[PDB]
Amino acid sequence: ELQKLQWAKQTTSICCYCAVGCGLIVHTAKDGQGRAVNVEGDPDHPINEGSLCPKGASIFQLGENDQRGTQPLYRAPFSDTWKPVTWDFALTEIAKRIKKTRDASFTEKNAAGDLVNRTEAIASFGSAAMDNEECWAYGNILRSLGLVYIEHQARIXHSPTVPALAESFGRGAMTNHWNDLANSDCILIMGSNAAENHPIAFKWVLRAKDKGATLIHVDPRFTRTSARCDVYAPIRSGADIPFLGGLIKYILDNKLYFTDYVREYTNASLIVGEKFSFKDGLFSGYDAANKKYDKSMWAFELDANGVPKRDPALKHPRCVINLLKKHYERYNLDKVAAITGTSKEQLQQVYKAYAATGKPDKAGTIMYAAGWTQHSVGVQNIRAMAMIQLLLGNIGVAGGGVNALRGESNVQGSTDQGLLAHIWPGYNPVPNSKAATLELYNAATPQSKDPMSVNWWQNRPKYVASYLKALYPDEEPAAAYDYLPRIDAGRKLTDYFWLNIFEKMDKGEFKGLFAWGMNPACGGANANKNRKAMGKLEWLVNVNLFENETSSFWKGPGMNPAEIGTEVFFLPCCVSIEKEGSVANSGRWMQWRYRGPKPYAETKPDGDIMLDMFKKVRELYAKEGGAYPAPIAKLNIADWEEHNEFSPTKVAKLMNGYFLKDTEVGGKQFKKGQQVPSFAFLTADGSTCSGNWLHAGSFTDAGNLMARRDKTQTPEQARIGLFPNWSFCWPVNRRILYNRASVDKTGKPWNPAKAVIEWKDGKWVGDVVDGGGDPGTKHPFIMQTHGFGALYGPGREEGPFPEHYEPLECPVSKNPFSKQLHNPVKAVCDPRYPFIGTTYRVTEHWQTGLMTRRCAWLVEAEPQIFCEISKELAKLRGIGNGDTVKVSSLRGALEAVAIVTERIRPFKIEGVDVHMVGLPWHYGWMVPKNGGDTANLLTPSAIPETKAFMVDVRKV
Amino acid sequence: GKMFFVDLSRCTACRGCQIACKQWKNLPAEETRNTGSHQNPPDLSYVTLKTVRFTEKSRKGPGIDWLFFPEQCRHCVEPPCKGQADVDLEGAVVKDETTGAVLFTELTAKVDGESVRSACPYDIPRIDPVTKRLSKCDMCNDRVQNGLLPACVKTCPTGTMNFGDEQEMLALAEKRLAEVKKTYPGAVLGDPNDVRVVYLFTRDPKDFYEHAVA
Ligand SMILES: Nc1nc2c(c(=O)[nH]1)N[C@H]1C(S)=C(S)[C@@H](COP(=O)(O)OP(=O)(O)OC[C@H]3O[C@@H](n4cnc5c(=O)[nH]c(N)nc54)[C@H](O)[C@@H]3O)O[C@H]1N2
Ligand SMILES: Nc1nc2c(c(=O)[nH]1)N[C@H]1C(S)=C(S)[C@@H](COP(=O)(O)OP(=O)(O)OC[C@H]3O[C@@H](n4cnc5c(=O)[nH]c(N)nc54)[C@H](O)[C@@H]3O)O[C@H]1N2
Ligand code: SF4
Ligand code: SF4
Ligand code: SF4
Ligand code: SF4
Ligand SMILES: [Cl-]
Ligand SMILES: [Cl-]
Ligand SMILES: [S]
Ligand SMILES: [W+6]
Secondary structure: OOHHHHOOEEEEEEOOOEOOOOEEEEEEHHHHOOOEEEEEEOOOOOOOOOOOOHHHHOHHHHHOOOOOOOOOEEEOOOOOOOEEOOHHHHHHHHHHHHHHHHHHHOEEEOOOOOEEEEOOOEEEEOOOOOOHHHHHHHHHHHHHOOOOOEEOOHHHHOOOHHHHHHHHHOOOOOOOOOHHHHHOOEEEEEOOOHHHHOOOHHHHHHHHHHOOOEEEEEOOOOOOOHHHOOEEEOOOOOOHHHHHHHHHHHHHHOOOOOHHHHHHHEOOOEEEOOOOOEEOOEEOOEEOOOOEEOHHHHOEOEOOOOOEOEOOOOOOOOEHHHHHHHHOOOOOHHHHHHHHOOOHHHHHHHHHHHHHHHOOOOOEEEEEOHHHHOOOOOHHHHHHHHHHHHHOOOOOOOOOOEEEOOOEOOHHHHHHOOOEOOEOHHHOEOOEOOOOOHHHHHHOOOOOOOOOOOOHHHHHHHHHHHHHHHHOOOOOHHHHOOOOOOEOOOOOHHHHOHHHHHHHHHOOOOOEEEEEOOOHHHHOOOHHHHHHHHHOOOEEEEEEOOOOOOOOHHHOOOOOHHHOOOEEEEEEEOOHHHOOEEEEOOOOEEEEEOOOOOOOOOOEOHHHHHHHHHHHHHHHHHHHOOOOOHHHHHOOOHHHEEOOEEOHHHHHHHHHOEEOOOEEEOOEEEOOOOEOOOHHHOOOOOOEOOOOHHHOOOEEOOEEHHHOEOOOOOHHHHHHOOOOOEOEEOOOOOOOOOHHHHEOOOOOEOOHHHOOEEEEOOEEEEOOOOOOOOOOOOOOOOOOOOOOEOOOOOOOOOOOOOOOOOOOOOOOOOOOOOOOOOOOOOOOOOOOOOEEEEEEOOOOOOOOOOOHHHOHHHHHHOOOOEEEEOHHHHHHHOOOOOOEEEEEEOOEEEEEEEEEOOOOOOEEEOOEEEOEEEEEOOOOOOOOOOOOOOHHHOOOOOOOOOOOEEEEEEEO | OEEEEEEHHHOOOOOHHHHHHHHHHOOOOOOOOOOOOOOOOOOOEOOEOOEEEEEEEOOOOOOOEEEEEEEOOOOOOOOHHHHHHOOOOOOOEEEOOOOOOEEEOHHHHHOOOOHHHHHOOOOOOEEOOOOOOEEOOOOOHHHHHOOOOOHHHHHOOOOOEEEEEHHHHHHHHHHHHHHHOOOOOOOEEOOOOOOOEEEEEOOOHHHHOOOOOO
C-alpha cells in the first residue's frame, strides 16, 4: 500500500490546460472530505494513457496553492488597496451595477427603428476555461441582459479556421482526433509547435513514424518539435501561401491528385460563371473605392433547376479543376524557393513526401494552430491546405484530415455555446436588426434542388426553436425570438469583436466589463493602450483563480490608483478538480470530470457565481421593474439548479434536450419529459427543447454518454483508434468528420487496412456514418449547400482561391506572383525598429502565465522572459548569450534575457538579411519576481498581428 | 530485477518527468534565473533528483542537433557509491534485493558525502548543506514494490521512458537500437551491462553530457 494514497478517495478529471484532453486521477484527503493529496495521469485514458506534460503534471501545485484567492475582494474608485468582502455584498452590489447600467443604456430600437432589445454599455470577455454547462449558462445570462459585445479567446486563436474549413467542408472543427494521428503515412506540422503546445499529441505522431510515416516540421524556428521530425524546413514568416501554392502546382503538374475522389467528392467538376476572372492579383467584381469584392461575380453557372452545372469529364475550361490548374501555374519552385527562403531541394523533398499521400491507400495530415491563425493570410492559408487535402483525397480518412489544433481545454465548447458576438449555441447566427421575425431568420438558410445534396442546415428551424424553448419554455418560439438582442444589419460584423471592444473601451463607450476567466491586461495586443483603456471603465467584474494584472491594472506599472476611478470586484472561482462538468477537446470529445476536493476557502464554481449574480439581477428587476424585463423574468433557470446550487448534470440534460410533450417524430412515439435521443428528433413546432442541437445525443435516456469510460472496440474501430464508447463527440459520435468520402460509391474503403466506415450487410460498420443513406446516393459533405468539398470557395472575402498577398509590410517591397503587393481587401515601419518581433509559447507556461507563474515547478524550469536571437544579430548588436537586453517598439519596451541560438537564422528577403527576434508572452508584472512583463507591451492593435511586428533589440 | 530503457531518440524535452518527480515526492522548487538557456534547474541538487539538460550542436544545412538528457542515478548493478560509503558507516547506502534499487538512507549524514559523490562515475550524488544527507533518484522504489511505474516513466508521453524486468528491457533496448540506427546511424546504449538505467543516445554520449557514460 502507498501511504500517500492509502486514505484518499480517487476520482477521474480532465486536464485544465490544452485541448488534447488528457485524463487525470485525483486523490483527495479524508475519502473526499479534505484537500487534494495527489494528481497524476489516468493510465486507462486512451488519449494520454497515464502520460502528462509538465502543465498537467503540476496541477496538484495549481490546486493546493496558498497564493489562490480565498474570498471576494472590493476595490473602491481612486482607492490604492483591496478590501475583503462577503459573497452576498459583491453579488448584490454587482447585480445593482448591471441593472443601473442596463436601465440607463438599454435600446428597444436602433436609429433605423428596427427592434434590437440590447445594451451596448456592457461587454464580456471569457472564457474557454469554464465547463461546457458554465459556458452555455453564461452566454444565455449575458443575452437575457441584452449584451451583444460577447467574446472570448476563440477570436484570436481560431476565428480564421471556422470560416475557412466551413467554406471548404461545411464545418469549422478539427476533422479527425488525436489518436487518428498514429494512422498517418505523412505528418506535416506547419504553423504549430505541437511537441511544446500539444505535447501528448507527440505520443501519436511518433507512433505514426514507428509504422513508417515521415514527420515534417515547416517553421521559421527550430523547436523541440523540429528535433523529433524527419524533415526540418525553415520558412520566412508569412510565406506559407507561396509554399502551399507550389504544393498545389506540384500535385497537378505531376498528376499526384486522387482522380476519383476529386471527380466525385470535390467541386472539381462544377462550372464557374463567365463573370469569374483573375488578373494581376485581383479577382473580378473588385471595387477599388471600398477595397471590396462583388462575390456574385464568382457564382457558379446554374442548370434550369437552380443546381450548379457539372462536367464529370473535367473538360470544360470553366470546370473548378481547370480554373485551379490555371490559377496555381504561377507558383513554380524558383519563385516559391526565392520568397520562402526554403531551398528548391527541400521544397522538392517535402512536396514528394506529402503528395505521395495522393495514393488511395496512403493518408497525409496537416497539424496547424497560431503560426497560421495569427498572420493576415490565416483564412486563405487554411483554405490552401484544405484544397491540397481534397486534391489528395485526405479528407474523411484515417490518418488524413485538417487537424486544426484548438488551444484551451474547452475553447471548442465555449465556441459551441456561442461565446462570440455573431453566434448563438450550435452556430445559429445572432439575428441582425433586419431579421425582424423568426420566419425571416429561417428564410436566410440556403436551399439545394440537388436530390443527392443532404444540405443538413435546412433543419436549422428545429434547432433555433428547440433553443428558444430551452430558454423560454412557456413562450412560443416566434414570441421568445423578440427577447434576445440583435446586432445592426448595417454594420461591419468585426465592430462587435475583441479588437473593436478595446477601441470602444479606450473611447469610454463602456460602463461595465466582465473579465470572466481571461487576463486581457496581458492577452490583448498593445497592453499599454489596454491597461490605460480599462481605467475608463466605471466598473469591472474579474472572475479568476488568483489576483492578476487585470483585477489589479489600477496598481500596475506607471499607474496611480488615486487618478483611477474604476470600481473593481474580484470573485475567486474554484479549479477544475474542485468541480463537476464537461470540457470539449479539439477532437470534439465531450468528457465528464468529477469533484476531487471541495472548493479551496470560500471559492465557488463559475456556475454558482454567475447563477447567483443573475438571481440577484432578476429579483432586483422583480421589486424595482425597469428596462424590458421579460427576457430576465422569463428565463428558465429552474432547470439549471438542484439542492440550491448550479447543477452541471441538469444543465447538460437541458443542452441535450427533452420532449416538452407527447410527440411523434421520424415515425417513433416519444413521451413528455423523455430525453431527446439525437438532433434528428428535434422539432420546429415546440414539441422539443435543446440548449445546443450539437449536444442532442450526449445525455439521452440511456445516460450521460460524456461520462462513458469504456474501451470496447470492434477490430476495425481498434485498428484506427476510434474509441466510440469512451465519452461522446458531436455530432452523434462521428469521430472522423466527412467519413462518407473514405469509401467508393459501392461503400468499400479506399484503404481497407484503415477503414473508417464500410458497407456490410445493408449497414455502415466502423465509425458512425457522417450522414445517412446507401452508398453512392448522397454527396459526402452534408453541411455544404451543394454537398462537395470546395476547392473553389465563392463565399470568401479575399477571393474564391487563395492568392499570395505579402503579410510583412515593412521589409518586403515587391510580389513575385502579381503587381498586388498587399491584400486588396498603415504600419509606420519606423527605421529605429529594424527587426521582426514574433511571440510564441514554451511547453512549461500557459497563455499570459496567470496560472503557471503561480506554480513553483513551472517557474523553476522557465523563471524569466527571454529574447531568442541568431548568432548573426547577436554578433551585430554585440549581445552575449544570457546578457540582459531591451526589446522596444512604437508601442512599448521591456527587458529580457538574451538566448543566442543557431535555432534562429536571419531571413534572406529581396537581397538583404532580415533578423527575426522571438519572445514568449507568458510574463506579467504581478508574479514572479524578476519574471518580466508581457511581450504585448510591444505588439500593435491595428484578430491582431502578434507573429510579426517591428522591434529594436539593444544590450542594457 | 528492474531496468529503465530511456530512448533519447523520442524525447521532446517536454520536462513532464522533471515536474512529475517533484509532484510525486512533494519536493520544493529552487531559486532559478535564465542565464541564456531553456535548461533549469541548471544542475541536480538535494531537492532536484532529475533535470533535463539541453545541448545545441551545429549540423550542415538548416536546424541543429538539439540533444536532450533527463539525468538520474543509473542504479548500477555494482554501486560504487555504496562501496565508498560502506567503509565509513555500512547501511548509509543499501541495495534492494527485490528491484535492484540503490537507495541512500538517513545514515548518509554520518559519511564523507563529497567522497561518496567522487566514487560515482556519473557524478550523481548531491549534499544537503544542512543535514549532510545525500539525495538522488530512488527509482520510485515505493511505487515499484506496489507495482506502479515510476512517476517520471508513467508521465512521459513520447515512449522515451520505459521500465520493467531486465530481460524484457534489455531485449527492447537491443531491438530499438537496431530500428533507431536507421534514422540515427551513430546510436549507442550507455553502459548496458553495468547499470539499471540504459540510455539510448543518438550519437556520442559525451555530447549529451560530460558524465552520460562511465
Ligand atoms: N505550452 C503551451 N501550450 C499551449 C498554449 C500555451 O500558452 N502554452 N496555448 C494554447 C493556445 S491558447 C493555442 S492557440 C495553441 C497555439 O499553438 P502554436 O500554434 O504551436 O503556438 P505558437 O508557439 O505561438 O506558434 C507555433 C509556431 O508557429 C511558428 N510561426 C510563426 N510565424 C509563422 C509563419 O508565418 N509561418 C509558419 N509556418 N509558422 C510560423 C512559430 O515559430 C512557432 O514555432 O497552443 C495551445 N497550447
Ligand atoms: N502576443 C501574443 N498575444 C497573444 C497570443 C500570442 O500568441 N501572442 N495568444 C492569443 C491567444 S491564441 C489567446 S487564446 C489569448 C488568451 O488570453 P487569455 O485567455 O486572456 O489568458 P489567460 O488568462 O492566461 O487564459 C486562461 C485563464 O483561464 C483562467 N481559468 C482557469 N480555470 C478557470 C475556471 O475554472 N474558471 C475561470 N473563470 N477561469 C479559469 C486562468 O486563471 C487564466 O486566467 O491570448 C492571445 N494573446
Ligand atoms: S497541457 Fe495538454 S498535453 Fe499537457 S497534460 Fe494537459 S492536456 Fe495533456
Ligand atoms: S524514478 Fe522516481 S525518483 Fe527517479 S527520477 Fe523518476 S520520478 Fe524521480
Ligand atoms: S549512478 Fe552513482 S549514485 Fe547512482 S547507483 Fe551509480 S554510483 Fe550510485
Ligand atoms: S517526459 Fe519523456 S519526452 Fe518529456 S522530457 Fe521527460 S523523457 Fe523527454
Ligand atoms: Cl466570422
Ligand atoms: Cl492507431
Ligand atoms: S484558445
Ligand atoms: W488560442
